[PDB]
Structures are given as C-alpha cells and as structure tokens.
Amino acid sequence: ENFQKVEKIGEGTYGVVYKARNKLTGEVVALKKIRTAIREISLLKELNHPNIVKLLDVIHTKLYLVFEFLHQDLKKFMDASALTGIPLPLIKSYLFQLLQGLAFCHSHRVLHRDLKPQNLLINTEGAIKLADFGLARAVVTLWYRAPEILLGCKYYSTAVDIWSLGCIFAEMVTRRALFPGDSEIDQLFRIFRTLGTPDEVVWPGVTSMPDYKPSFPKWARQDFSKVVPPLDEDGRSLLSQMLHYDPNKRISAKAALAHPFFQDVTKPVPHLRL
Ligand SMILES: CC[C@H](CO)Nc1nc(NCc2ccccc2)c2ncn(C(C)C)c2n1
Numbered sequence: 343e344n345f346q347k348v349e350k351i352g353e354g355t356y357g358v359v360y361k362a363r364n365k366l367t368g369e370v371v372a373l374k375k376i377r378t379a380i381r382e383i384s385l386l387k388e389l390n391h392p393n394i395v396k397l398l399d400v401i402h403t404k405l406y407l408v409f410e411f412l413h414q415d416l417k418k419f420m421d422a423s424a425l426t427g428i429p430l431p432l433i434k435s436y437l438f439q440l441l442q443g444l445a446f447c448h449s450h451r452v453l454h455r456d457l458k459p460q461n462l463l464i465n466t467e468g469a470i471k472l473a474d475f476g477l478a479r480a481v482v483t484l485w486y487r488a489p490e491i492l493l494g495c496k497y498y499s500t501a502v503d504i505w506s507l508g509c510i511f512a513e514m515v516t517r518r519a520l521f522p523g524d525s526e527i528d529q530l531f532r533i534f535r536t537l538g539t540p541d542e543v544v545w546p547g548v549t550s551m552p553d554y555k556p557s558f559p560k561w562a563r564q565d566f567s568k569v570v571p572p573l574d575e576d577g578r579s580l581l582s583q584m585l586h587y588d589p590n591k592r593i594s595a596k597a598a599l600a601h602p603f604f605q606d607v608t609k610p611v612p613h614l615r616l
Pocket residue numbers: 351352353354355359361372373374395409410411412413414415460461462463473474
C-alpha cells in the first residue's frame with residue numbers, strides 16, 4: 343500500500359473519503375474510493391482554479407481519486423458559527439469565491455449539479471473551494487436542487503449550480519436551510535410556497551415540463567424581506583436573481599460577479615478551530 347489512511351473523513355455522494363499520507367512522499371491528501379468515464383475524469387487533472395479542489399491523480403483497478411486535502415467543510419463551519427452567525431464580509435468573500443469557481447468550470451462546460459455546504463471546503467487562509475463534483479455519469483439531500491431538475495428536465499444547465507449556490511447563500515445569512523424538503527414533491531412544494539407556484543408568465547414552458555401537474559397547488563409568492571430578513575437590499579437583489587425560476591433568466595456566475603453586492607468585497611480570514 344502506497345497510502346497510510348489517516349482517518350475516514352466521511353462519505354461523499356459517490357464513495358468513501360479518507361485522509362491519507364503518501365508513505366514515500368509525506369504528502370497529506372484526500373482519497374475518494376468509488377465503486378469512458380475514465381477519459382473525461384482524467385481531463386479534470388490539469389484544469390485548475392484557486393476555488394476548485396485540485397484533483398491530483400486517478401487510479402483504476404474500483405476507482406480512486408486523489409485530491410488535495412482541506413481541513414474543514416462549510417457545513418461544519420456554519421454549525422460552529424450558528425450562535426453568532428458568519429460575519430457578512432466573510433459570507434460575501436465566500437460567495438464571491440464560489441462564483442469565481444463556478445464561472446471557471448461553467449466556462450469549460452463542466453457542471454457540478456450537487457452543490458451543498460458539505461462539499462464546500464475551507465482553509466485557514468480564507469479560501470473556499472468547490473469539491474465533490476457530480477461527474478460520475480458525466481439518504482440524498484434535496485435541499486439545494488433546482489426546480490427544473492425536480493420537474494424532470496433531462497437537459498438542465500449550468501443554471502442548476504447558481505440555484506444551489508443561492509440556497510447556500512441564504513443559509514449562511516439566516517442560519518437555517520432555505521428549502522429543507524424530505525421528498526422530491528415536498529422539496530418542490532417548499533420552493534413553491536416561498537417563491538410562488540411558477541406559471542407561464544414567469545417561466546414559459548413550465549407547464550410542459552415532464553413532471554409538471556396542472557393539479558399543483560397555486561401558492562402566492564412571498565417577499566424576500568421575509569425570506570432572508572437580515573440581508574441588505576444588494577444581497578436580496580442578487581439572491582432574487584440567483585433563484586429565478588426560468589433557468590434562462592437566472593443570473594450567470596460571470597454576471598453575478600459584477601453585481602453591486604460585491605463592490606466592497608474583501609477576503610477576511612475565518613476563525614477555524616481544527
Ligand atoms: C465532509 C464532506 C466532504 C464531502 O465532499 N468530505 C471532504 N472533506 C474534506 N475535508 C474536510 C474534513 C476534514 C477532516 C475530517 C472531516 C472533513 C476534504 N478534503 C479534500 N476532499 C476531497 C475528497 C474533495 C475532501 N472531502
């Protein structure tokens with residue numbers, strides 16, 4: 343064995359993840375054990391960005407992915423910060439960095455598809471990185487799933503990642519999940535009860551979606567002032583554009599980076615207890 347497993351650090355959406363040390367290198371890494379796709383996965387090795395976890399190596403026998411190791415994830419950090427809240431400048435820095443990562447991978451036609459706080463990794467320097475990409479084909483948490491996925495769209499787009507990141511943004515601010523559904527229909531109806539049941543006016547073609555039913559209850563939209571109360575008007579405007587129902591009207595990552603909310607963005611350092 344080339345890798346001394348330091349500690350099982352959990353279970354990703356596609357396999358088991360270990361903290362490990364290379365015996366003849368000393369390098370400390372994260373090992374994801376899993377289970378054509380070999381070709382596409384391998385390409386990810388030399389597409390690098392500061393806000394994307396580095397893929398170091400791909401090993402086939404059962405499939406192994408060797409990643410750089412980060413010491414905390416955002417769910418843990420959110421939980422550790424729940425009595426006080428994450429300071430707004432750090433929320434804003436993290437959101438800005440995550441949109442840079444998404445803009446990079448979307449510009450290379452790579453989607454994540456399963457963003458959640460557990461797959462956002464942070465370090466002591468104030469960086470945050472996207473991990474646990476849903477790139478295998480290319481109980482489960484539904485809380486961050488975009489409505490077009492839930493309505494059965496087969497060919498959903500980079501917009502699904504903006505939706506997920508919007509839900510995470512809201513959760514950092516309010517310290518409660520925005521849409522904590524426990525079934526696909528509960529997830530959909532939680533979205534509808536907050537943003538209003540979508541119709542052809544705000545989402546042309548929605549009533550043609552594979553899983554759309556005319557029998558869906560018709561809930562009125564609530565106001566974002568009620569949804570993420572603390573957040574200022576710049577923040578609420580950006581969030582509203584990240585949660586547009588119509589994937590074609592939803593803001594892109596590149597466009598979100600230009601939003602006035604980020605005019606005063608900085609890079610604070612988190613207080614991490616490791
Ligand atoms: C905690 C859930 C998260 C799944 O994405 N696991 C995780 N967690 C990582 N670090 C956070 C952590 C450290 C120690 C114990 C538990 C979690 C981590 N670092 C690199 N990677 C690669 C596989 C993407 C990591 N993956």
